[PDB]
Each structure stands twice: as structure tokens, then as C-alpha cells.
Symmetry: D3
Subunit: 251 residues, 6 copies
């Protein structure tokens, strides 16, 4: 969008760093420089003493539709997730519409997710013969357990905001026409809270839950690099772009 650098829009609204994914025309699909740009602003929030909370949202119809340079983009995505979880300040995702593939990992890296009634979470990777990325394989089971994670990954089904909330995937659900006001309420309340105690709470929860994040991210990066060489990905990438149902062979 106009005024955004590498598809990321950043502004300060008092104590809030407002970061907005800003390629609405591609439903906020991400590439390498957009990911790198995102993580810079996330990292730089730490040393910025006016920032007490980060708000992550997306412009247009969707929060984030996921990845489009396999090694490169995978690394940059993994780094964004790491930057969000290691930032000693609260990061809130406001998720409306689709949160798909890395879009899903991205929301779930955040401390709190406020989900609009029509929003959804989906690992669509397998639909193109690919595997989850961003660390989703580590983030999701500590949210919803192994069996529902395994289902998300293998079936590529959409999980509604209501279901994601019932499963403990996300901290907040909204209903009716209240998405915006609840998001505003949560943001104002968190950005006025004891930021240092939030930081220390994050460090302890990170140790409790993220021990495997980086080894799992390594396996995903390695897997995706192998999977883009397979006959199934070529078929997957072709059948998606043609609005045809793919014919997978296991090769």
C-alpha cells in the first residue's frame, strides 16, 4: 500500500506500535522482504520506550493468507515468530477474515489474539503438497493438543474463530458487531498495564512452552526445502493456480 515499506504499515498511537500487514490486493500474502521488514519493527519495539504494546492487524479482507525463495522466506518467517515471542512486551493480533498457513503461525505467535466472528485459522499447506511453517508444528500443540493439530495439518480444514476459542487456540473471541470495540478495549487495557511484569511473564511462559520452537522450525525449513522438489508440490502449485482439485501421488 501507499506509505508502507515492503508491504508493512507502522504508526504510533500513544503507547501502541500499530503494525499492519499492507498488501490487501494479495490478501496480505507474505514474501521475504515483507517478513524481514516486519521483524525489524517487532525487534525495534523493545528499545522504543514509548511502546508499551504492539498491535498486529492486516489491511483488506484478510489478516494474512500466508506465503506466496524457499530457504529465504522460511528463515524470515521463522525469525518473525521468534521476534514476537522474545519481545518483552505484549503483542496482540487483531484477526479478521482469513489466517492461513504462515498467517495462522503469525497470529498464534502473539500473546493475545482477538478474533472477529467470521475470522478463521487454517493450515492449507497440505492442499499444495507442503508442510506447516513458521513454527506452527510447535505452537499449535501447546495451544490445542496434538490430535487437533494433527487434524489441522493433515486435513487442511478451516477452523472458525468460535471453534479456535473453544479449543484454547486463541485468547479472545468476539461476536456480533463488537470486534472493533473489544479489540480497542483489550488494547487500551494492556497498553496501560504493568509492561515490565508482562515482559517477565512472557519470558517465563516462553521457557515453559517454546523449548522446541527453534528445533521444530529447523525441521520445517528442511522439510519445505525437500517438498518443493517433489512431484506432489508441482501438481499442488499447478492445481491451486488452476482452480482444479490436485491429483497427489506420494512422490
Amino acid at each position: 500500500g501507499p506509505g508502507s515499506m515492503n508491504g508493512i504499515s507502522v504508526e504510533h498511537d500513544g503507547a501502541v506500535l500499530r503494525i499492519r500487514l499492507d498488501r490487501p490486493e494479495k490478501l496480505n500474502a507474505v514474501d521475504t522482504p515483507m517478513l524481514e521488514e516486519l521483524s525489524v519493527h517487532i525487534r525495534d519495539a523493545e528499545a522504543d520506550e514509548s511502546v508499551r504494546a504492539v498491535l498486529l492487524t492486516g489491511a483488506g479482507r484478510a489478516f494474512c493468507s500466508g506465503g506466496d525463495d524457499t530457504a529465504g522466506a522460511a528463515d524470515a518467517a521463522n525469525r518473525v515468530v521468534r521476534a514476537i515471542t522474545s519481545l518483552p512486551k505484549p503483542v496482540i493480533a487483531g484477526v479478521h477474515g482469513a489466517a492461513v498457513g504462515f498467517g495462522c503461525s503469525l497470529a498464534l505467535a502473539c500473546d493475545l489474539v482477538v478474533a472477529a466472528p467470521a475470522s478463521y485459522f487454517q493450515l492449507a499447506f497440505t492442499r499444495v503438497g507442503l508442510m506447516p511453517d513458521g513454527g506452527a508444528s510447535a505452537l499449535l500443540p501447546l495451544l490445542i493438543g496434538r490430535a487437533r493439530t494433527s487434524r489441522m495439518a493433515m486435513t487442511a480444514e478451516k477452523i472458525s474463530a468460535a471453534t479456535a476459542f473453544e479449543w484454547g487456540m486463541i485468547s479472545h473471541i468476539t461476536s456480533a458487531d463488537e470486534y472493533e470495540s473489544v479489540l480497542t478495549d483489550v488494547l487500551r487495557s494492556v497498553s496501560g498495564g504493568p509492561t515490565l511484569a508482562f515482559g517477565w511473564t512472557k519470558r517465563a511462559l516462553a521457557a515453559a512452552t517454546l523449548a522446541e520452537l527453534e528445533p521444530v522450525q529447523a525441521i520445517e525449513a528442511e522439510g519445505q526445502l525437500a517438498l518443493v522438489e517433489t512431484a506432489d508440490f508441482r501438481e499442488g502449485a499447478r492445481a491451486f493456480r488452476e482452480r482444479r482439485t490436485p491429483n497427489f501421488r506420494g512422490h
Copy 2:
């Protein structure tokens, strides 16, 4: 054509592995547990196999150990390790009882499609024994520590519906639809991107199963301790005499 209580057939790209002792409610002994792992190993080597179906013939999926402690323990642990390390999806079609190691067996699989009358139960402590097969490691990353403690300590039957609501299992079926949904899930996963499924499993295994082996070692050691106790003696005796055990904590 079953061997050591296991039948196997190919149906296109699916290896169908079926526990075949309905005359004993698919209770398992060591030969049967060893036999299972053989076919999981065949699945890995067989280029035509794109998914494994695991079910029990008859009323029960698997009613756990017939009640050679160390050998059974090792065989049970190895079946679960084989299933979770197989880089191809394994679907458990759970009908009726999944009890004791039966429960660990279903929960080892990547997806579980449960019939409405199926149930999941750690009956171990009814006879003075402890969970096995890695159940102590598998259950908490499904349903959390508190519900796992309760299952193990009270030995209550958990219904398919409840197990589904808790996150224990991926799929539930209702009415008379169990077979058709199971068939649908099988057809879908076996025509799916098998290599992407193997990688997914690998990433998820690293995220969730780091303690599986250490925990299985603790369980085998404990079961070996516990079969020596007077409580196990009473438990087994009370089971056979169709009565309530009188445990004393020794």
C-alpha cells in the same frame, strides 16, 4: 490368514492392520504386540503403502494387556514408537473399547476416528498397575495433565464424545455413520501428499514426543516393580474372582 492375532491386507494404497482376537476382545500378548510392529515396518518399506488403517475386528478396538512383564512392556513401547516414527499417516478406526494399552495404541496414531459407542480408559489401576505404552507421555499433550491424572487414578471410561470434546482424538462419528466417515477419511488421506504428511509428522513428533522414550522407560521400570506388589496380587485375584479389590498400598 491372520498370524499371531493380526490380520493384514492391502486395499489399494492402504495397509489395513486389524487386531484379530475378538474371541478375547482384542486383548494383546507379546507375540501379538511383536507382530504389529512387523507390519508397521512393512508399511515404511512398501512403496505402494500411502496410509495405514489400524482397527480391531469385532466389538473392541483393543482391550489392552492380557493379565512376561518386561517383554510385553518392550513390545508395547516399540509398537507406539514404530507408529509415531512411521513417515506415513496411520489412522485408528476406534470402535468399542480402547482400554489400557488399547488407549495408548489408538492415541499413538495420527488421526483417530471414533465410533459413537467407543470409549477410552486407563483401567490399569483397577488391578494395581500403572499406565503403559507411553500413555503418560501421550495423554498430557492431548488433554492436559489434570485430565490425565484423573483418567489414570480413577480408571474411568471416557466416552468418544467426551474424548473428542477434550482434544484427545481428531474425529468423532455419530448415528450409523462410523464406517462411512472412516472410509472417507481413509480415501482422502491415502490419496493425499504422502511425503508432506511424513514431514508434518516428523515436525509434530519433535514438538510433542521428546519425553516419549524417557517416560516409556519409567513405565516399564514401574510395571516391573508393581507386578511384585501385594496390591497387584490382590488386583489380579479380585479381577478373576469378579469382585472389588482391597488395596493396601503395598
Copy 3:
């Protein structure tokens, strides 16, 4: 009671009652240290097959006192209480009525089974005075309810009802109507009459599976609490609680 802890034998059950009802069983270091030995001393006691943990008065436990100025001391003692319960090779049951707040939440959730009264609740109120979770709550909670519901509890300081805690899988048992006492009795009877050695082995396997980060996380919480009491936000939090008004946090 000695140091705010009552201890009574009742058949094969060791009953440990937190007994400072005049402060809603808010805890200090003496009280925690006292609690901890009575827990490990149940290992030794051949008559004890189960431990029951409850609180006298209106609340299970309102958590850390905020008196004493013994920050590292309290944090250490609270940590050791939680470790002793998870490590005792005998079942420990929390019967929770009323408030389980701050370390009171950590305490209940360290137990093997929790039987919650209908009006009971679980709450990480620490952040309302600018402090962070303790006892090792940060490691316990995610393996109960997942990371998202934990972050919320810790960051918003909301009360979680007994009913909600049960749905989430935070606690093993829920009661309703006037049935709390009777259900508690039923569960204590059955557990204390159970295969105690089997229970102890089950606990060891389950601790190996779920508590690998308990110690490192407790050390992080203890360092964090030490840093947090020096902050302007804590001075303001404490002052606001004292003056019953809303704190004005600054992030310093």
C-alpha cells in the same frame, strides 16, 4: 495450627488445612516452609495414603501476603511447596472452595486432583499490583489449559470460575449444588483406598512427561519477581491496592 497450618490424621488421609482465615489464607515464608515439611513427611508416614489440602474460612488461598519483605525467601519457599507436592509419591488432593489467587492458584494446580466448589475460582491477580505469576504457575498452567488461555489469565488477571476451569481441563473435578463436601469425601475415600504404589509410579511417569521445565521456569519467576518489586509500577500497584483505587501503570 503452627505457622498458619493445621495438620490432622483421618484414617489413611493426611489433612493439611491452611489456617490463617483472618487473612484469607494469604501466605508468608514461615507458613510456606511449614506446609512443605508436612508434605514431604507424608512420604515417610506409612499410615498416610493420600494428602488432602484445604483452606479454613472463606477462601482456599489468596496467595502471597505482600508483607515481610522477604521476596527471594518467599519465592523459594513457594517454589519448594509446589515441587514437594508434585514429587510426593502419594496422591495429593486440593479441595478448593472460594478464592485460589496468585500462589493459591499455583498451589491447587500442583496437586494431582482438584475438587472445586461451585463458587470457587482461580485467578492470577499478581499483575494488578505489577507482579508476575509465581510458584511455577507459568510451567503448570500451559500443560493444563494451553499457552493462550495462560497468557490471558496472567495478562488480564481475570477470575476463572470453577465451571470454566473444569471445561478448560485446568482441574480434574467439578462439583455443583450443595454437593461439594460429599463429592470431596467420595474422591478422598476412593483415592486413599487405592493402589498407592501404582499412584506413586503413575505420578513419576506423569511428572517426567509434563514437568521438565518446572525448575528453570521457577528460577525465571523468582528472578523476575525480584526485579519487579524494585519497579515504579509495583510501588504504584501496592499503593493502589492499599488505597483501594485503580493503579496507574507506566511500564517502569
Copy 4:
């Protein structure tokens, strides 16, 4: 067993069992009339304190297999259950479909097996609900869920039926038979006259429209069996096809 119904006494319980398992307890007029008679005769029988209604075989009752006569007899069976001053418990295992649904839901208590289900399958063959189901279901699950069941002819699981308030009791795991047994034992040993009175008061609160609605349903069914849509529906069912409905 006569006209597809077996009746036996087990202490203070009248066990009435739909006994056409080969046809999944599909019903005709003489079966429906047989059923009415024994339900009604439970009243005079001093030794009966509870009526158990179940079906033999795979299904509780698959519904209608002589339109006017069948509708009247089906309507009589329901009035007979609802007005019997003694509790009737339906033990529902498997399918309760069409009139088999109305039959179950007329009972005072319903104990559902986990794989059991409830369905108004009538419109799949171009017909409407009968037995008085159009009156029974809204005072169980409300008008919107009823409209849905009737118009989509979807199967409602026991679990969902329980959650909606359609049925009094759900069972799980392998416990169906035990629970049914405990419920039957408890009800048959209870204060039968108070149950009789409790029923009368409930019937007056809930069943004012029952006979009037039953009359509309009987009239409707007579009209619908003349339609091309019934003609196509009945044949499609027999030939295992999707029916071509045209609204005439």
C-alpha cells in the same frame, strides 16, 4: 408375539417390543393397532407399574412401511402412550425414523444408546410428519429445530437430541443396557400414582394441540400420497436413488 409385537411381564414392568427385526421394525396398520391395545391394557393391569417400549434387531423403529388407516392407528398409538396414567420408557437403540421418532418422543422418558438417532425422514419420500410429531417436537426442541428436522430430514444423533432437550436420557460407552435397567428399575419401584398425576398435569400443559395437529397431519398425508412427488419418492427409495421432486 402377534402382528409384529411381543409382550411380556418382568415383575412390575410391561415389556413391549416391536418385533419385526427383519424389516427394521417398519410398521403397518395391524402392527400399530396391536401396539395400541397392549399400551391401553397396561392401565387396568394392577401388576404393571411401568411400560418399557423397545425394538428388536438393529432399529428401534424405521417408521411407516392404506394411508388413512395407518395414520389413524399411528395417531392412536401416540394418544395411548401420552394418556396412559403410568410411565412409559422408550429404550432407543439405533434408528428412530419417521413414525419411529414420534413413537419414541411420545414416551415419558427416553434412554438413547450412543449410536442411536432420530430423524423425520418423511420428506425424503415426499410425505409429511405423522403420529403428532408436528405437535410433540416443538414443545421438546422448539419450532426452528423442528422445522429443520422436518424440512431437511437430517439424522439427529442421540448426543445432539439430548443436548437439544429432545430426550430425557443419553448413555455412553457400553453402558446403554445398564442405564436402561437402572432407570426402569427405579421408575417401576417408584410412586406410580404420583407419576400418573404428574403425567396428566404435563399432558394438559403440553398436549392441547396434539389431536388437532394429528388431524391436519392425517389429512395432509392423504393429499400427499396422490402427488407425483410421493410417486417419485417411494420408487426412488425402493431403487436406492435420489428422488426427483417437483412440488406436485
Copy 5:
């Protein structure tokens, strides 16, 4: 103190009517019910009253009829009728037991705010009696007929959370919030458009209460018969004695 077991007070625009025989868990007799009726009806002509709050003293909202059958049954019916036809909103603040007529009484009100440990029970048949106050008519248009049959035939306790989830009652509370939610509801309602509420009530009553009087007359007749029965005598004796009644159906 109170007159005939009822205490009345004004709190701003709220008339608070309190069941005040805590020693008997607010069990009700004919004079208490007649008093109750008088004060509910009093609200109609008192212009300072914009809402009625009904609560119970002591440990329970109301344990139902004190074990004058005709007199009491008729008086209970008139209490329910006075609540339902009062053109002002009536709120039950229910804590603890609301049993027998105590359930009917709560369920007559326009809104019910239930404390987390409160519960609703039709305990009638446990003493060989039937529901009263119009409960047979009130309950089915709340929770449906099957759940009503169950409540009446089994005399099981329905927790506040379950009653809420069933649509039996308008408001649930949890944790230590009962008093403050109740206060908030009362403030909001008593400061609301009372006349609009009156009319709202009137239309709703015409939609749902058409059977309330005929059903009440059936309950009254039934209780008149049931107290002549052996089963009532066994039920009363066994309740008093804290043991299992042997019912005969006579």
C-alpha cells in the same frame, strides 16, 4: 421481625420480599403463602415500586411446602398467578436450594439470577407427591417436555449452570459475583421503562401461560388425591427418617 414468615422492605424503587423462615429453610405453609400473595399484589398500586426482588433468608431460597393440602395448594397457585400477572418485573435472587414449590416460585418470576451453588429440584415424587404451583405448566415452556418429565420423575437436582444452559433461568453468576450481579440487574431493571416492561410481560404471559390455570387445577386435584395414598405416607415417613421409601403405587 416478619409477619407469617415473610419480610418486606423498600430499597429505592425496589420492593424486596424475603422468605424469612431460615430455620426451616423457608419452607412454606398456607399463612406464609397468603402473606406472600398480599405483598406481591401490593406492588401493583405502589407507585414507588418499579421492580420486585424475591429472595430467601438463611441457607436456601425456599425448600418448598412444609410437610391443609387444599388450602396450601390453592394459596401457592395464587402466589404464582399474582407474580405472573403483576405488571411490574419480578426478579428471583436464588441462592442455595429452590426445591418443590421453591422452584415453581422462582420459575414464576420474570428474571432469575442464580448463585453458583444454587439449584432447582422437583423433589415431590420423593415423598409420593406431584409438582405444584403451576410448575407442570411453567417448566415445559422453559426447558421443554422431556427435561420436565425427567426433573419430575427422578426428582434430581438441577445445578444453576445446567438450569442456565437449559434456558430454565435468565441469569447465571459465578465466583463471588452473585450479590454484585444481582444488585446490577436490580438497579438496571428498577431504573428501566417499567410501563414498557409491564406491557412486555402481558404479551409474553398471553403467549406462554394459557395453560397455567387449568394445569394448576389439575395439580391441586392431584395433590388432594396423593395425600390420601400409602405412598405419600411412606414417602413422608421415609423423608423424616432419612432413609429409602418403599413405594407400592398405592
Copy 6:
């Protein structure tokens, strides 16, 4: 014309509330017009289902204008939908408020978007429910939930409405339009005469009080528009402030 737009689409008559700039708020001519098109679906042999939706951001925001006339027209719309011997499906997205709620709930099926909501906002301005909502809602969700809705004027989410049995269908994610399309295709190809009869029976079962109740609501609203609280309610609504109600 009169803020209603109509169109045939195969066997579906699409009726769309068409005053998006006012969030489909309704007045007498719009209500009278809506009646006419609902009524004319009966005699139109190409029509097998009616679809009711709203253009713009809201299904229907509900009801200066004449109270007597508008209330009457509203009542007539609700009687028209419920007596039409063809399925009427409301596709509800956004707000269904006041009569907007009545109008949805009058229909045979309702397919609700995930951000949709249902609300009786009347008492917030010192008025009472209308269109027969007082009769419709208790046979959907029970008297307790109805009383709370009417008295508190709170918004009920689509999810909650579905949980409560208020509405037949719920949608989630981006699937609203797809589900609505599928339900309309399946219902418009169904046994339309069977559906007509089913409706008639359901109506006799559940709508006996509809007209007595609609009369009470029409009388009441006429009284309430004369009150000081309505003057205060409408002022406070207009001025985007909190009303100070006094019970006069």
C-alpha cells in the same frame, strides 16, 4: 418499489430489503409492499422457496411514522410468511433488530452469518416487542431467554441464537453465502407440497397465540408511544445518550 426488490432465480423467489442507507429500517409502505410479494409467491407456480435477505450492512434494523399502521403492517408480514404454503428462508447477515428479529424468526429456516445478531431493542427506547415476537420467541428459546431478551435489549450472537434453538442454521468462516446457496438449492428442489403441509401442521402446533399476542402488542405500543419514557427513550436514542427512564 417502497424499498423492496424482488427477483426470480430458478425456483427461488428472492425478496431483498432494499433500504441499505438506513440499514433496512422499515416503515408502513415498505411493510405493506413486503406483504404483497410474500403473498404473491403463493399463486406463482414457478416459485418453490422464498429467500428473504437485506442489501447493505444489515438484514433489518427494525421500525415519526404511524404506530397503528406500522404495527398492523408488521403483523401482516409475519402472518403472511407463516401462512405461505412454501418454505421461506431468511439469510441473515449483520443486525436483525426489533421487527428485523421478528421477521427472521417468522421464517421456516434462518441461515445466520457469523457476525449476525438478533436483538429486541424496543425497551431501550421505552417500547415493547412487536410483530408477534412475544409469541414467536418462547416457542423457539423458552420464556426465560425471551424475557431476558425483551427486558435487557441485549444483542444475541448468531452462535448463541443457534445454541438456544432460535434459528435453524449457523455459518462460520467465509462460508455464509455458500451455505445459504446450498440450503436454498436443496429446499427449492424439495417436495414443496409436503413442505406446505408440514408448515400447516407446525403452525397449528405453535402459532395459536400469535394473533391474540399481536393484538396485545399493538394495543400496548399505542399506549407506550403516549408515555414520558418513550419521549425520553427516543430523545436519548436520537442524541446518542443514555435515557433516564422513570416508569411514566
